[PDB]
Design a protein around this ligand. Structure first.
Ligand SMILES: *C1O[C@H](CO)[C@@H](O[C@@H]2O[C@H](CO)[C@@H](O)[C@H](O)[C@H]2NC(C)=O)[C@H](O)[C@H]1NC(C)=O
Ligand SMILES: *[C@@H]1O[C@H](CO)[C@@H](O[C@@H]2O[C@H](CO)[C@@H](O)[C@H](O)[C@H]2NC(C)=O)[C@H](O)[C@H]1NC(C)=O
Ligand SMILES: *[C@@H]1O[C@H](CO)[C@@H](O[C@@H]2O[C@H](CO)[C@@H](O)[C@H](O)[C@H]2NC(C)=O)[C@H](O)[C@H]1NC(C)=O
Ligand SMILES: *[C@@H]1O[C@H](CO)[C@@H](O[C@@H]2O[C@H](CO)[C@@H](O)[C@H](O)[C@H]2NC(C)=O)[C@H](O)[C@H]1NC(C)=O
Ligand SMILES: *[C@@H]1O[C@H](CO)[C@@H](O[C@@H]2O[C@H](CO)[C@@H](O)[C@H](O)[C@H]2NC(C)=O)[C@H](O)[C@H]1NC(C)=O
Ligand SMILES: *[C@@H]1O[C@H](CO)[C@@H](O[C@@H]2O[C@H](CO)[C@@H](O)[C@H](O)[C@H]2NC(C)=O)[C@H](O)[C@H]1NC(C)=O
Ligand SMILES: *[C@H]1O[C@H](CO)[C@@H](O[C@@H]2O[C@H](CO)[C@@H](O)[C@H](O)[C@H]2NC(C)=O)[C@H](O)[C@H]1NC(C)=O
Ligand SMILES: CC(=O)N[C@@H]1[C@@H](O)[C@H](O)[C@@H](CO)O[C@H]1O
Ligand SMILES: *[C@@H]1O[C@H](CO)[C@@H](O)[C@H](O)[C@H]1NC(C)=O
Ligand SMILES: *[C@@H]1O[C@H](CO)[C@@H](O)[C@H](O)[C@H]1NC(C)=O
Ligand SMILES: *[C@@H]1O[C@H](CO)[C@@H](O)[C@H](O)[C@H]1NC(C)=O
Ligand SMILES: *[C@@H]1O[C@H](CO)[C@@H](O)[C@H](O)[C@H]1NC(C)=O
Lengths: 262, 48, 372, 49, 34, 48, 49, 49, 48
């Protein structure tokens, strides 16, 4: 199924400072008590990061993907559930789908015929006193597939929590010579509406030899067909740049501090 | 190399043919600086 | 013959003056080879690569990747269905006995007049305009009849080749183009034109066609060997983890020579090879039993020969610089006159309690001399 | 008055654990010996100092 | 004054054919002359 | 060279191709020792 | 040059001077009719620059 | 002129600041060179200053 | 020029295999029935 969901308030594109976030382990190589110097596609320190809301509002645009992307969300109720990456996004070429449906995380590469406004959607506490997934409106068709992964089954909560943000989730996406490399981190938080000032390193959790052109990306959120409530979440998109970084590994070999050399 | 002028190599050859020429100039010009800095490091001890 | 002969050979003189002379470095030789790789299980995707629903057209031939798998070619070489099974950079028997860094299957369908163009160094409309193998092509070409799989009695025109192009394509290029060929001197704008040809034509594959005029499904297995940390392997080689001995080690493809030892360093779950201040590999995770191993290159040092003048004696003593005596026995091994010094092991010289004026200087307060 | 004495296996620095590289390193002749002499002359004069 | 790899029977320097040799006069012999 | 790691070149190539790649590293390394020994012979004269 | 009707005998090879004109070399290099197009002091792609 | 630019004169690519010279090139010369063999003056091909 | 000794190795091969007769090659002629050393001094001659 495929639908356009037009009931939104107009807000300007917000911006916040990406203080010292967006460093990732550049290789799978152990180092300790050392200040290693490396040039790679890192997020520039103290640079303006583009800020998006779900609230009234449900900001989900198609965005550039150029030399790789930093994505971060400060979150409650598990509202950010996936991404689309690729060059045409309309089954003329293959594209990468990442989704977190309530059963289990799925990753796939196919000629996906994606919807103009793609989303996941959930029945909010409907008599069953459970939050229930029901709408999966991301692609109409998927023709030539050549990669598929599905995680072992589980039961993540769609529960409509209330309060400020309690989960931070950081990701770096790079598509190099056909290798789509995901670096990511999770850390607990207690913040109202901004990306927390602190240092973090992203570990490489998965690498996929997908072999496609990615020129852009889009993010998938959990929402009779118009007029609805979006559960509140904040998310941030930054673009990586080639920049020499100096990386302080501590005794236990974990990037503990970094310097952006410009 | 086909020239002493670095931009006249890059005005005429593509990446795969140019790097065979540019590397000669790098090898010879880095030998020139190491020679100069050696002469200056030896000289500086006459003045010290 | 002896250390004195090495000093005469070093100094290019048949007679050597009194002194201590540096000579060719001592270095412990490796005891054995050791291969330490991540445990494998599942077989490579041969049931997709050869028995898939439909295959590619040759004008735009498929490439499918083979990765994180156990490679077996005995099924492919014993199976009587394949009319061509030819290898251009390995022997076809040795395929099971061998490991690969990355692997792909170029997958497509062609006519029997053109199967000869799939071999490297060729020319003609397949070799020129859609599928060129490189001059150094390493891998194998495999072909079989598919008229019972891919054909319809009208001719299955789903399979396309290229017939024209601006140039002969570069090895492993895939050309998708449908833009019109300007055969005459005039340009061409829009979809069609006079004396232009469309650059593609389909084949007339029918179940009644005679052998060679039938659809042949071709797989070309391109693989590259040993040169990088590997992602495909055969059903065999990884070997038992020895410790505290000099070895020719290989961890995941990281080849080297060194002593192995149990490390107290901790590695986080994504980190495999550990490095030093100078970016040299000082440790590695065993990829099976997950424990961290210290690496050290096998014991070595300068070998210095203490001699009186040749005019005095042919007796000499030997210093293994910065090397513990316990490590010398590896190779004068008699001893009963050996001596550890701060400078290194001393062999052939007798330690004396009496302090004398320094004759030949060894280092760290020690000197040596020729005396009764 | 002095500095640390050093000596280098010029064959192990250039070609450590390779025979193919050691057999190519013979194409250059005296340099590894001339380098060992230099560092030995430096080292022997730290004791003189 | 700090030091490194003084030559006594004990990585990065050692591992590559580089060696540091001990002084002839130990810091005790230097102190007896002093 | 295609790598700085000597044992890698010896597995990525056969002899008549590897000799070109290995000689890059023999050339550059030998220039690194010749430079260190120049710096140390100049230094040793300041210490003398 | 390329589309004259008669060429010279190789003992008596003919030499035309090309002058006071714009040389779009992309036309010749992109023409499949040339079985050889070997340049010895430029790469062929650079000729327009 | 008087700004930093990526110039190209008759394929003489480079980077620099262009200013009106008082060097008087004889007709046969398009370029002047430095001690380092780099071009340090040029005659513009459309207005021959 | 002159030569101390000369040997004409004479044989028949397929036209695809002439490239294998060069020094530093592999393939079933070079590997199993006729190998030249990496330093081969001499000339390879072939005619259909
Ligand atoms: C690969 O398989 C082996 C078993 O076949 C696993 O290693 C075992 O680990 C236990 C606990 O240390 C030992 O008691 C066994 O003796 C080991 N067996 C062998 C054959 O080594 C190993 O865990 C497997 N690989 C991974 C990554 O788990
Ligand atoms: C990867 O995809 C991008 C986007 O589809 C390609 O860039 C496009 O190229 C066309 C043709 O020149 C332009 O009309 C578009 O405006 C370009 N868009 C973008 C975002 O770049 C790019 O060329 C592709 N890369 C490869 C190697 O095929
Ligand atoms: C989450 O997504 C996966 C993948 O789309 C769904 O898995 C499918 O489930 C159906 C019904 O059990 C099967 O018939 C399909 O074969 C499954 N496909 C794959 C590739 O797993 C899963 O059902 C989804 N979960 C929910 C709760 O909607
Ligand atoms: C490296 O990690 C270890 C283990 O997490 C840290 O050692 C722990 O330190 C705390 C606080 O002093 C103790 O309560 C634990 O008992 C220690 N663990 C054990 C099992 O001994 C260590 O501090 C970390 N190192 C650094 C530099 O952060
Ligand atoms: C040479 O190596 C041996 C080990 O083989 C060292 O001997 C050890 O010395 C310590 C300190 O006295 C003892 O606690 C160990 O039990 C000894 N073990 C053995 C097996 O000898 C020796 O000290 C080393 N010598 C030098 C000069 O480094
Ligand atoms: C470049 O163009 C200019 C004209 O645009 C040419 O220069 C002209 O030359 C005639 C004869 O001397 C003068 O009458 C004009 O006044 C000049 N032009 C201008 C703009 O004043 C020049 O010849 C052209 N370049 C070349 C190489 O011929
Ligand atoms: C996978 O299937 C799609 C759809 O059948 C193929 O796309 C077609 O490709 C041909 C060749 O360029 C065109 O004639 C069609 O117009 C395309 N159709 C569509 C719907 O886009 C694609 O080529 C197939 N890929 C493989 C490897 O078989
Ligand atoms: C009103 C409503 O949504 N009811 C749902 C029902 O549709 C669903 O089939 C069932 C599954 O257990 O849970 C409840
Ligand atoms: C960030 O935005 C502020 C406006 O709030 C602006 O003044 C500043 O120049 C911007 N900096 C960068 C690096 O974009
Ligand atoms: C393909 O199928 C045939 C039988 O139709 C079988 O003999 C062969 O082993 C199969 N090959 C692969 C790679 O699955
Ligand atoms: C050394 O000894 C030999 C006899 O063995 C003698 O011919 C020579 O003159 C001696 N020279 C010196 C300097 O001792
Ligand atoms: C030196 O004297 C000590 C006693 O002071 C004795 O233990 C040792 O064996 C002696 N060494 C030699 C070589 O005689």
């Amino acid at each position: 199924q495929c639908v356009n969901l037009t009931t939104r308030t107009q807000l300007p594109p917000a911006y916040t400072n990406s203080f010292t976030r967006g460093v990732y382990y550049p290789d799978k190589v152990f180092r300790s008590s050392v200040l290693h110097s490396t040039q790679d596609l890192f997020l520039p320190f103290f640079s303006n990061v583009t800020w998006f809301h779900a609230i009234k509002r449900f900001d989900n645009p198609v965005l550039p993907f150029n030399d790789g992307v930093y994505f971060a969300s400060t979150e409650k109720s598990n509202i950010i559930r996936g991404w689309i990456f690729g060059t045409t996004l309309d089954s003329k070429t293959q594209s990468l789908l990442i989704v977190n449906n309530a059963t289990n995380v799925v990753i796939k590469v196919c000629e996906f015929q994606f919807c103009n406004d793609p989303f996941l959607g959930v029945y909010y506490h409907k008599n069953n006193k459970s939050w229930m997934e029901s709408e999966f409106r991301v692609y109409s068709s998927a023709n030539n597939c050549t990669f598929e992964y599905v995680s072992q089954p589980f039961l993540m909560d769609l529960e409509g929590k209330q309060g400020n943000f309690k989960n931070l989730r950081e990701f770096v996406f790079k598509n190099i010579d056909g290798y789509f490399k995901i670096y990511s981190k999770h850390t607990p938080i207690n913040l109202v509406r901004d990306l927390p000032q602190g240092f973090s390193a992203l570990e490489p959790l998965v690498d996929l030899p997908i072999g496609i052109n990615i020129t852009r990306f889009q993010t998938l959120l959990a929402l009779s067909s118009s007029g609805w409530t979006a559960g509140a979440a904040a998310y941030y998109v930054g673009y990586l740049q080639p920049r020499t970084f100096l990386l302080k590994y501590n005794e236990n070999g974990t990037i503990t501090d970094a310097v952006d050399c410009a | 190399a086909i020239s002493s002028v670095l931009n006249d190599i890059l005005s005429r050859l593509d990446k795969v043919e140019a790097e065979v020429q540019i590397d000669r100039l790098i090898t010879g010009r880095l030998q020139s600086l190491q020679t100069y800095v050696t002469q200056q490091l030896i000289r500086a001890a006459e003045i010290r | 013959l002896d250390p004195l002969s090495e000093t005469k050979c070093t100094l290019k003189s048949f007679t050597v003056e009194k002194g201590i002379y540096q000579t060719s470095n001592f270095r412990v030789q490796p005891t054995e080879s050791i291969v330490r790789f991540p445990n494998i299980t599942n077989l490579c995707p041969f049931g997709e690569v050869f028995n898939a629903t439909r295959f590619a057209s040759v004008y735009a031939w498929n490439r499918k990747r083979i990765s994180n798998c156990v490679a077996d070619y005995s099924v492919l070489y014993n199976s009587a269905s394949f009319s061509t099974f030819k290898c251009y950079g390995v022997s076809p028997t040795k395929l099971n006995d061998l490991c690969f860094t990355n692997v792909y299957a170029d997958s497509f369908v062609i006519r029997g007049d053109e199967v000869r163009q799939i071999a490297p160094g060729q020319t003609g409309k397949i070799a020129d305009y859609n599928y060129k193998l490189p001059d150094d092509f390493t891998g194998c070409v495999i072909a079989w009849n598919s008229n019972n799989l891919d054909s319809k009695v009208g001719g299955n025109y789903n399979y396309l080749y290229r017939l024209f192009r601006k140039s002969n394509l570069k090895p492993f290029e895939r050309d998708i183009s449908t833009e019109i060929y300007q055969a005459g001197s005039t340009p061409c704008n829009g979809v069609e034109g006079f004396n232009c040809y469309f650059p593609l034509q389909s084949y007339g594959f029918q179940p009644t066609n005679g052998v060679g005029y039938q659809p042949y499904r071709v797989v070309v297995l391109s693989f590259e060997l040993l040169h990088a940390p590997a992602t495909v392997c055969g059903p065999k080689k990884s070997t038992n983890l020895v410790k505290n001995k000099c070895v020719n080690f290989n961890f995941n493809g990281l080849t080297g020579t060194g002593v192995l030892t149990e490390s107290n360093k901790k590695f986080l779950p994504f980190q495999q090879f550990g490095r030093d201040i100078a970016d040299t590999t000082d440790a590695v995770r065993d990829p099976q039993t997950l424990e961290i191993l210290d690496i050290t290159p096998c014991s070595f040092g300068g070998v210095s020969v203490i001699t009186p003048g040749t005019n005095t004696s042919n007796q000499v003593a030997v210093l293994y610089q910065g090397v513990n005596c316990t490590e010398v026995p590896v190779a004068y091994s008699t001893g009963s006159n050996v001596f550890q010094t701060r400078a290194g092991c001393l062999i052939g010289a007798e330690h004396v309690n009496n302090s004398y004026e320094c004759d030949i200087p060894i280092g760290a307060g020690i000197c040596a001399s020729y005396q009764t | 008055v002095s500095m640390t004495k050093t000596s280098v296996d010029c064959t192990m620095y250039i070609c450590g654990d390779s025979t193919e590289c050691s057999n190519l390193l013979l194409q250059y002749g005296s340099f590894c010996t001339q380098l060992n002499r230099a560092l030995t002359g430096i080292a022997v004069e730290q004791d003189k100092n | 004054v700090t030091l490194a790899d003084a030559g006594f029977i004990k990585c990065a320097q050692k591992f590559n054919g580089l060696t540091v040799l001990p002084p002839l006069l130990t810091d005790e012999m230097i102190a007896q002359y002093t």
